[PDB]
């Protein structure tokens, strides 16, 4: 029977120098101390941060510690350094190796509402038979921002793909781009194209719309 690992929280937003606490719960008891913690920075391979629940590999700073037993384990960063903001996984090896979903430690900053822009498809792309409508959410925090598409006030589903940038190094904000793809015929059949943005920094979802033909 596989041991499912669930980490808490999903995302940990703290300031540099604070204490980070990542919990790792298991669906079954982990024998002895067969648990490890890994750290992964963006674009890098996971690094063994801690082995044997509490033991520490050579080179890992003293600020990283590990405790727990049975089904509850905990990774602790006493003083968060700037290089510590990254993803952390827990892995049991009492049975078949399984990982937790991962916990992201990011910079904590003031709530920033996104600047919402919209871009219609170009005539050059319409000549190809496909219409891409782009919605840009510029410089917002936190990362959680819901983008919905409304074609003639009809909610879209399945024809939108979004992409998020990493947390910026200067203002610690995120940016998002949502592409709504239609056919040229489906694009000409409709008039109003609107991008609705829901974010914690907005007292109400903001809608950026344009009418085909005038744009």
């Amino acid at each position: 029977h596989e041991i499912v690992l669930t980490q808490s929280p999903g995302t940990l937003s703290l300031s540099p120098g604070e204490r980070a606490t990542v919990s790792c719960r298991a669906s079954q008891s982990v024998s002895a101390s067969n648990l490890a913690w890994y750290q992964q920075k963006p674009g890098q391979a996971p690094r063994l941060l801690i082995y044997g629940v509490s033991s520490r590999p050579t080179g890992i700073p003293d600020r990283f510690s590990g405790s727990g037993s049975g089904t509850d384990f905990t990774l602790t960063v006493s003083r968060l350094e700037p290089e510590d903001f990254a993803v952390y996984y827990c892995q049991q090896y009492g049975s078949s190796p399984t990982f937790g979903q991962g916990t992201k430690v990011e910079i904590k900053r003031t709530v920033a509402a996104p600047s919402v822009f919209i871009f219609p498809p170009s005539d050059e792309q319409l000549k190809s038979g496909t219409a891409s409508v782009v919605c840009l959410l510029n410089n917002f925090y936190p990362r959680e921002a819901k983008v919905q598409w409304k074609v003639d006030n009809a909610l879209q589903s399945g024809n939108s793909q979004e992409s998020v940038t990493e947390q910026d190094s200067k203002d610690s904000t995120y940016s998002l781009s949502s592409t709504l793809t239609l056919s040229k015929a489906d694009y000409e059949k409709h008039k109003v194209y609107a991008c609705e943005v829901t974010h914690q920094g907005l007292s109400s979802p903001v809608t950026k719309s344009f009418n085909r033909g005038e744009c």
Binding site: P97, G102, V134, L136, S177
Partner: protein
């Protein structure tokens, strides 16, 4: 210091067989287990399998009858095969050293099945698409893409394969306010990204996005001029 060196095919068609190899330097395959783990883009880690110097293998029960692990002791290498590949297998695949073999008084075997050191990781993408150059479309600035004295423009790099493409602005002279977004894998099997830039309104100033796709050697210098709304 034991070092791991990964290689293998990074492009596969659906239903084909993934084949990756991992060479061990600065140490021997004996005395440890050696594991393959994978991570889909933007997702978590998933242990694939493990094999020791003797040839004993173990694999994730969730993968069923796909994992085929092999060991070349003469070359100090170990290889992973994943047949009947699918779109859910597009991921970065790492190899790592698993648990060592310890010798105690009444018991001997492998313990501490953690992963250190790790390999660099090979990105394997599963797609029916072949090499294709991108189309660069101007995300033009207008009244809908302006907020006070701040406007936004950019380029849409649509329908290209495989990864990656590089986007510069004004031949690298424009770096501030630029956001080049990670590409998304469209339902057509082709990649697509968007590179935007935030500028002042009073400048609307020549803006040219330079898109470079090495697998197709396609370079496009697209000028983004404001449209109407």
């Amino acid at each position: 210091q034991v070092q791991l060196q990964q290689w293998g095919a990074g492009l596969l068609k659906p239903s084909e067989t993934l084949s990756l190899t991992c060479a061990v330097y600065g140490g021997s395959l004996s005395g440890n287990f050696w594991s393959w783990i994978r991570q889909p883009p933007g997702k978590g880690l998933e242990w694939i399998g493990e094999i020791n110097h003797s040839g004993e293998t173990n694999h994730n029960p969730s993968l069923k009858r796909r994992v085929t692990l092999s060991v070349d002791t003469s070359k100090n290498q170990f290889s992973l095969k994943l047949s009947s590949v699918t779109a859910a297998d597009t991921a970065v695949y790492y190899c790592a050293r698993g648990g060592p073999k310890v010798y105690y008084e009444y018991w001997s075997g492998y313990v501490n099945n953690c992963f250190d050191p790790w390999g660099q990781g090979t990105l394997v993408t599963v797609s029916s698409a072949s090499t294709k150059g991108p189309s660069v479309f101007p995300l033009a600035p207008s009244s809908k893409s302006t907020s006070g004295g701040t406007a936004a423009l950019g380029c849409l790099v649509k329908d290209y394969f495989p990864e990656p493409v590089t986007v510069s602005w004004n031949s690298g002279a424009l770096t501030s306010g630029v956001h080049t977004f990670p590409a998304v894998l469209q339902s057509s099997g082709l990649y697509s990204l968007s590179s935007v830039v935030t500028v002042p309104s009073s400048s609307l100033q020549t803006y040219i996005c330079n898109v470079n796709h090495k697998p197709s050697n396609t370079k496009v210098d697209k000028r983004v001029e404001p449209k109407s709304c």
